[PDB]
A paper describes a structure:
The advent of next generation synchrotron beamlines has necessitated the development of new strategies to fully benefit from the increased beam intensity and smaller beam sizes while minimizing radiation damage. The high dose rates, in conjunction with the newly developed ultrafast raster scanning goniometer brings formerly time-consuming serial crystallography measurements into the minutes range. These new opportunities mean that inhomogeneous large crystals can now deliver high quality data collected from their best volume, and crystals as small as 5 to 10 µm can deliver one or more complete datasets.
PHM is a dicopper enzyme involved in peptide amidation: it hydroxylates the C-terminal glycine Cα in the first step of a sequential two-step process to produce the amidated peptide product. Thirteen crystals were identified in the loop and multiple centers defined for collection of partial datasets with 0.2° oscillation and a total rotation of 20° to avoid overlapping of crystals. The datasets were processed individually using XDS and seven datasets were selected and scaled with XSCALE to give a final dataset to 2.7 Å resolution with 〈I/σ(I)〉 of 2.8, with overall Rmerge of 13.0%, Rpim of 6.2%, and CC1/2 of 99.1%, with values of 58.0%, 30.9%, and 83.0% in the highest resolution shell, respectively. The structures align well, with an RMSD of only 0.6 Å. In the case of H108A-PHM, a multicentering approach was used to collect the data and then the individual datasets were processed and scaled to give a complete dataset. This option works well for cases with a handful of small, easily distinguishable crystals that will survive 10 to 20° of data collection.
Numbering used by the authors: 47, 53 to 306, 310 to 354
The structure:
Amino acid sequence: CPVTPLDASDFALDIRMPGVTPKESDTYFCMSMRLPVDEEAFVIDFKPRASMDTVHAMLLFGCNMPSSTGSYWFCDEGTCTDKANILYAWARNAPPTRLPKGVGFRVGGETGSKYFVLQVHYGDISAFRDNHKDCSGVSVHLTRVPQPLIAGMYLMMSVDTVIPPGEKVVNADISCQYKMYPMHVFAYRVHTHHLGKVVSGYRVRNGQWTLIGRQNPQLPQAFYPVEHPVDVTFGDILAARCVFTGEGRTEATHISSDEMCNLYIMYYMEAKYALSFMTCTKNVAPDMFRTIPAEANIPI
Ligand SMILES: [Cu+2]
Ligand code: NI
């Protein structure tokens, strides 16, 4: 097939799979890079270096303690033992979002992610590549120069809805009250396991819904650009609906076991008042979903 300093303030780190040999199709490899600095640094850019022939997708996470110590591992074992803050999502034939000017992820120091964990997913494998080494990964741009806007993730996950067997349509709803400084959403990622039909994200302010993003979870799960970023402010509600099918299923499915309904909202905040991670696992305002826009029920 290390560390490259660019100027006084900046430097570049590339996180590459260490010459792995995926044997078969639909296989996920995970690896880790500890952060070279112990002071706070800002990830301000990404360069993907994926072999076009065999790599379906790549995920970059930041987390305090990862799932394995070895040069690489299967991500079926896990990504991080702790919160995996997703930093980067690349998919073949997918728009990779470019962070807006002056946006950087805060890493290192007291609060910031200690490690990067790289996930590479390989979907198309020839059996006449029984011993070919791949060094797939991404290049990260770090600066110690402080950024005015800090990127972070609002993770919306449906902790319990059950899909009754054979129900053609089942709705998974998540809502939380926003009680922080203003967050500006520039991207979103939706995740689900093959019963999902559509995932839609909304800001609700004074009973008026504003769309963040709608996607089919069966498509490439990259980060989709929010064409005009949504401002989410204190006293707003974030509401999300996942649509599922119970069709063809013998038993009830759970959303530990079975299904997932996850919405990833990528945002920026003024550095002064910024926090990197927020989560919602509640549906505080269930009654409100009657008034949900009709678009949210329209499939893709
Ligand atoms: Cu999942
Ligand atoms: Ni191990």
